[PDB]
Amino acid sequence: PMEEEEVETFAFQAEIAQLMSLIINTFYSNKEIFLRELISNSSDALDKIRYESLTDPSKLDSGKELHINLIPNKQDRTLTIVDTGIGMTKADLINNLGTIAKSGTKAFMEALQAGADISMIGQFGVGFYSAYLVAEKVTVITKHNDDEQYAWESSAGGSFTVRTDTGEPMGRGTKVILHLKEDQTEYLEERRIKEIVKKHSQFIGYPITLFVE
Ligand SMILES: Nc1ncnc2c1ncn2[C@@H]1O[C@H](COP(=O)(O)OP(=O)(O)OP(=O)(O)O)[C@@H](O)[C@H]1O
Numbered sequence: 641p642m643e644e645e646e647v648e649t650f651a652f653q654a655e656i657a658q659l660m661s662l663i664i665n666t667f668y669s670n671k672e673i674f675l676r677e678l679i680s681n682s683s684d685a686l687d688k689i690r691y692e693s694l695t696d697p698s699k700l701d702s703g704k705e706l707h708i709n710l711i712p713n714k715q716d717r718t719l720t721i722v723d724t725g726i727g728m729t730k731a732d733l734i735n736n737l738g739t740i741a742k743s744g745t746k747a748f749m750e751a752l753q754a755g756a757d758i759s760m761i762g763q764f765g766v767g768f769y770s771a772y773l774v775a776e777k778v779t780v781i782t783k784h785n786d787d788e789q790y791a792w793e794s795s796a797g798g799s800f801t802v803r804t805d806t807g808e809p810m811g812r813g814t815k816v817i818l819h820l821k822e823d824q825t826e827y828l829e830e831r832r833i834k835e836i837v838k839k840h841s842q843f844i845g846y847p848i849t850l851f852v853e
């Protein structure tokens with residue numbers, strides 16, 4: 641073909657693959673907590689960049705504003721969570737989002753069997769995967785300070801890919817893009833989103849902005 645793109649395909653760590661099918665194939669009632677989990681991740685990443693700037697203000701040259709944006713797109717049926725946090729290196733993506741085992745995974749699977757609410761997911765070190773409560777597919781674009789912009793992607797099925805991102809440059813941070821299931825479109829509604837952020841994400845030490853089309 642005219643153009644070529646390098647893709648790297650990785651198997652999810654076995655327990656995490658198993659946690660993902662559990663999340664996807666079980667019925668759960670309290671799905672809205674996915675949003676709280678992604679906002680926390682953005683909040684953590686922003687704490688991190690903030691921490692690093694204390695000793696090295698140069699680290700904020702890639703953008704000084706520390707914040708989180710929420711972007712529903714009804715045309716594409718996507719909900720995007722953007723932060724100007726620390727972002728992830730390629731290796732961060734690979735190690736931290738699927739490939740390296742987590743201490744709490746087995747235990748969280750155990751708790752789910754007993755009938756735990758999925759809301760507890762974030763106590764175990766696997767909160768990200770709550771996204772698959774409402775998304776058939778998740779794309780993570782990320783730009784860390786001394787590395788290139790990358791795109792992580794997976795629709796489950798036990799696998800994810802990482803590639804150099806060919807999209808619009810970010811400066812610094814992470815964009816999580818949720819391709820929503822057809823029965824989960826309420827999470828594109830301005831009212832629903834506002835309700836959910838007020839109920840679950842009111843201890844975020846950063847400004848959050850909802851962009852409404
Ligand atoms: N928005 C983000 N910016 C930077 N790194 C992120 C972001 N989201 C996820 N990560 C990385 O992926 C890892 C997995 O996140 P996940 O939410 O599954 O677990 P956690 O936040 O470490 O713990 P838990 O969510 O269970 O309290 C995180 O530790 C973090 O390093």
Ligand SMILES: [Mg+2]
Nearest residue numbers: 680681767768
């Ligand atoms: Mg988390």
